[PDB]
Amino acid sequence: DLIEIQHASFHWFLEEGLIEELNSFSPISDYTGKLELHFLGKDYKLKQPKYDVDESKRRDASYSVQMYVPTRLINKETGEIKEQEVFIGDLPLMTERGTFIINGAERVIVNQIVRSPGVYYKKELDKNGRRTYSASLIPNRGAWLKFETDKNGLVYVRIKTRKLSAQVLLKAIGLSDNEILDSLHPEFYQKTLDKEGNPTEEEALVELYKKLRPPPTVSGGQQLLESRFFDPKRYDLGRVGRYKLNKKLRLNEADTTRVLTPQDILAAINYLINLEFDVGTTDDIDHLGNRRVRSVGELLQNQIRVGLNRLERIIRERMTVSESDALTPASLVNPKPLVAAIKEFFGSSQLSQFMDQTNPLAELTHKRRISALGPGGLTRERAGFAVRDIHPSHHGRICPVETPEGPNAGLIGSLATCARVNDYGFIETPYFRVESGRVRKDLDPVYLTADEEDDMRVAPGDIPTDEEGNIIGESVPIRYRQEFSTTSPEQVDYVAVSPVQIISVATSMIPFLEHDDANRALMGSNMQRQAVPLLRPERPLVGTGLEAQAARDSGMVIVSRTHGIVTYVDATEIRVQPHSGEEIVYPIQKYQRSNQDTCLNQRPLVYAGEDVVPGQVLADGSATEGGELALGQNILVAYMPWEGYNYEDAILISERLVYDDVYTSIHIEKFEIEARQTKLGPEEITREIPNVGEDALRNLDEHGIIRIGAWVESGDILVGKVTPKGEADQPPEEKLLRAIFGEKARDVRDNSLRVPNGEKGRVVDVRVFTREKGDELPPGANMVVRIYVAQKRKIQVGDKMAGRHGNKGIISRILPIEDMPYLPDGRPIDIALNPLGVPSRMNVGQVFECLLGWAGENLGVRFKITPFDMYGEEASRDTVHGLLEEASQRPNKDWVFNENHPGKIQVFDGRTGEPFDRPITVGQAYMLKLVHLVDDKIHARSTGPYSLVTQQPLGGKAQQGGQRFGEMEVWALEAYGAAYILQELLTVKSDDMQGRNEALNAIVKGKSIPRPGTPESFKVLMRELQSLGLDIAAHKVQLSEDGESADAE
């Protein structure tokens, strides 16, 4: 299973994470001691949800459950036990795909990588001086212990504040002079004991309080130090903090997990002194053995911990004011601070991200992202060069290729294919045991938790092995202590289980990965997660074979579980019968809206009367073919330059891709309107709207709302809504115009929902959610109407297409089939790609892919080639050229392979009919269609809305915004002679309530006027500087007159 960091994490929270939080919260007491409240956390209910999975997405709700615990309220003096179940909070459940539904939108919880708790030592040179060793005891939650060591044998303890001597903390926790020196070399400790005095057990708590809290008190020094490291519910090492203390310092005690042991502070000082004696290891901060990951089971444990602490303040403020008895325990627990704590984590936190649902490849990748940012991780400004590079401990755990380019280059990683996280939070990799030069591929792997660095010798999965005898190679390259070396095959210990263990699940879909560059393989893995689901997908011919596993783990593929006989198959359900209440129904969704405006259509695959197996595809998804995944189409390609139509990364396609419904996707948009409550009068949805005739009232059913199946275009009316007005401030021009022809204006105003510019399609869902029907509504709303419009988009000029090797491009021309070049059998060419971008970017694998897919086209065999071989030069060139020779041995196909030029044939011109001078490489390429279509990039504005303060035009496609003329754009016009264009762009086009009126009136009348006025943004800055206490004004230097000018008035 590829999703185990989400399913096993939420399963741990429902049985171990929720029980541990309620056991530490209980019991609580009052100020006097009259009654006590303790919970029973291990007997909670977790009742049934309210709505369905598909119903919660359209009703704008969350798939959540109610949490109830039994609560026993006892009293100290009077014997009474009050058992009652009290509501705790709303907990959203994880769906079957591993996601959550928050406010009708599907969301994921990205796993965040942080540092592991423990002690870490570091050699630091602050200046050109001696060698200083530092320390840092990091807990899971609480204060930090930073031990430093200066020159001349002075070890200090810093607990944010100023540093202090090591004897001050070591004596205040409770110790003797003989219990320190017996377990310490004590000759180095005499230099820090001379210039520190010699305090007793009570002569150190007073001096500790004088420097931390600057009167000292004998009772104040004990309450300050115990609350930092020794008090419960304020300092936590964690289950993994106790494990890292017993490994580094080699401690004998274990299973403490709550209180910091004072013997552990003595062991951290002893390891720091011995670092000057050239013994001990300096820890690394970028090592994956020191870096942990956490998931939904751990991140939810911190939100209930800060949510129950707010509940502890109200539970102690209600058992003291009410001095009377006979009170119910259900009124002591207020669920309001804990409901708002869970709702803030799932909807308002940064780590809960919007789920990418373009294709099943992006859904599987987004659940396995390893990001180093979040509330407790790193910062965008605090990220440096060392944290973004690849550590040598990332071999097989984190993918070195798949990472987003730009700002987050290296901070957001991806988990590898065979990687696995244990219960402690460390990434593990499987390895096969090698015994005396023989790979023992018979038993289960070892799953080493990054402990193979300083102990084991690990070989990758690329060495030639024999059939159970020995290893063929005499020099095996291995890795030992983060360095590569070639040793004997009898000296190795472990070997990798797969050659795709290093790369992730999205990089493994690229065939011939070893022939492509690592920079273009980064782009090829990112463009595969943006491919739209087509209308009829097609499986690739040069697939790697891992597409079948990624389709079943995405959750959008109906699988069988019963091993039965299929009875009834239609377009909505599949009914089988289980055998060794026997009729289950598998529902099939038809054209459901996704998050990225794509389709989630499922098609039936099986027929009636067929034996099935557990793990068989019953119904494939939208971007999924039969069994395996399918994100694009296999069509003909040719690497030849046309007449400037493929000049700089441009694509020339044919007309055959248009009328054959190739690269044709279905996009479903969703519109929203609401009949709110205006204080002047309630708004309602009517059909008789003013100033709109029969040109737009054709699809309404006398209710103001459109019908199902009506073709809407740009500028129509979906929901006709009116709004009452109470202005009554008519100008004298409109009063004279209305008095002539009559037709007195009504009190309503047309606020109908309309279709935006460049939008069309067919309406498929006109679901209306009103009150008194069984659904909750937001306050200040009478009727909520939701309109879903689906449209069928073909492939056009301006769309961005790409392949699996980073050869992205934008189509500039769609030629007919008689103008495209044609093969010597008469078959035309679909895509005419440019061969100039190939040798400059090292995209060699895309030439191996098309030449192998052309061999699979004439044979019809659908090759499955795994990456990272076999014999050198005999597995990539002679595989392609050897299989192209077999396709040429057919009696009908003799023109496929040539002896002089192997990977080339003769191509004829379509316009003139003459052959070209040189042979051209042809093949069957697998191209994808990305989400960056030409329809979403069109924006234009003449005059629209304006800003609130600066009175400048707004910015945005969805709100009719204007393009920003920034500071780099002024410097280009200032370097030109364009002074009148610069004054026009800053005055009459932005921030002038007077200059915009006269400039617009000049074009309609036909006589332009010069000299625009003062812009509004300068007068805002003039009033802001006067409010800062600065007498700033503008004057005139005219003859015998120095007067201030009034820019505002």
Binding site: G977, Y980, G1006, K1007, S1008
Partner: protein, 58 residues
């Protein structure tokens, strides 16, 4: 031939930021003189100020 007429106007003038103001100040006179019903769509007043200034240059 409008781009060939503009390079002859920018040359032999010693200031390219001054002769473009005389084109812009002559196009406003050609626009006010063309206020009748006859309006040529091919010959704009901004283009007619460049052709008339190059004929008087010689």
């Amino acid at each position: 031939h409008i781009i060939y007429r503009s390079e002859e106007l920018l040359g032999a003038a010693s200031n390219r930021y001054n002769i473009t103001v005389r084109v812009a100040k002559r196009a406003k006179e050609n626009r006010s003189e063309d206020f009748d019903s006859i309006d040529d769509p091919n010959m704009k007043p901004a283009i007619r100020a460049i052709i008339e200034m190059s004929d008087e240059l010689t």
